[PDB]
């Protein structure tokens, strides 16, 4: 019933700026102190800062690492909190979370790079001709920047046996990612298997049917 929806994350030049937002519902917004926490890839939670209620004069406190550059604000009428980021550095690259101290949003990724946006190619990992019966099939989402891509199977109706591997940074500085699902071997003629790939940064949406190869 408590919801926190971050938005405004994406790719940005070093030295540049970006404004994050946090659409809150299911709690009397004005009484709560909103916080930003961030997480670099495979690393710790870092506190960014906190804005207090109107009755506290909307007082703001910041982590040493971001003080001067970041600005938290709120809009109690729109039930929204903000993080304005200036003089962004590569070190600031992370998933940024919005908290009312009790709940976190799903998060939004800020990448600070001079590297260009690039849309992925989606290739089938086709199941083989074999009797043993569990069968494995998948999608290779190849050559994208920046993170992230999402993968679902059959519009989210197929979730059991699904492994979506972490992206690997390739030698070229582009990401690649695999999603696989084990299914009953006897379904390979009759059940359609579609992987739905989205790469929002590049505006790429693909539905790839994975079937046995002729």
């Amino acid at each position: 019933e408590v919801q926190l929806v971050e938005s405004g994350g994406g790719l940005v030049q070093p030295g540049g700026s970006l404004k994050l937002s946090c659409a809150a519902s299911g709690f009397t917004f004005s009484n709560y102190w909103m916080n930003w926490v961030r997480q670099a890839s495979g690393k710790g939670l870092e506190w960014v800062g906190e804005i207090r209620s109107k009755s506290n004069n909307y007082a703001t406190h910041y982590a040493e690492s971001v003080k001067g550059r970041f600005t938290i604000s709120r809009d109690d009428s729109k039930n929204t909190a903000y993080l304005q980021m200036n003089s962004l550095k590569t070190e600031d690259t992370a998933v940024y979370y919005c908290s009312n101290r009790y709940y976190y949003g799903q998060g939004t990724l800020v990448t600070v790079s001079s590297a260009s946006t690039k849309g992925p190619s989606v290739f089938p990992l086709a199941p083989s001709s074999k009797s043993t019966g569990t069968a494995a099939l998948g999608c290779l989402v190849k050559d994208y920047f920046p993170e992230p891509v999402t993968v679902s199977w059959n519009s989210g109706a197929l979730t059991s046996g699904v492994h979506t591997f972490p992206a690997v940074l390739q030698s070229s500085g582009l990401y690649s990612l695999s999603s696989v699902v084990t299914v009953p071997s006897s379904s390979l003629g009759t059940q359609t298997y579609i992987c739905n790939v989205n790469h929002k940064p590049s505006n790429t949406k693909v539905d790839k049917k994975v079937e046995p190869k002729s």
Partner: protein
Amino acid sequence: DIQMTQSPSSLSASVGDRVTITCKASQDVNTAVAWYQQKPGKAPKLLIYWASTRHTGVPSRFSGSGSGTDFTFTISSLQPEDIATYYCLQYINYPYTFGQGTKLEIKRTVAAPSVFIFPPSDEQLKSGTASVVCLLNNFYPREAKVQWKVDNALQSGNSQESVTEQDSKDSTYSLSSTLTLSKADYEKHKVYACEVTHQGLSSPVTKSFNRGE
């Protein structure tokens, strides 16, 4: 700046074990300490605040205690879905500080991988590159050796692996290995093999295909 140092950094424990994590604050922080679970790919979840208050809807099997500098996070009976990194935070003074976090992994019985090989698609060969994929599915423990051979030649430096986090139900790992070749190099060779060494296999398992059959 109040330090929070958690003990230990990582912990392996069996399903049903009592698990205990400690967090040491470099100054008195009274009961102004929270505990956080972060499952893989998910947002932090608040479990405990005011050192010992359970946040609503959180399972009773999670508990916190402490006062002053020394604080404890307990799981009474470790469940398979409790695979996560656990965080202590101090909220007495600005700036609020997290501990480095404790990565909780589950010990279980050995499970041998299922191994599958995937040829590159015709669609990708149009691009001038060939990606061959080896899937090691639902194995334990994590340690796994993948070797690529192309017409008997061990391939080294032209592959990359990715391991999922421990499954929330069966506590298994999965691994995918991708071998990237030029189309030209791919079209010059016949036999494509990945060989998988793992504790749960009596000897190495090989899956292969011949380009075109």
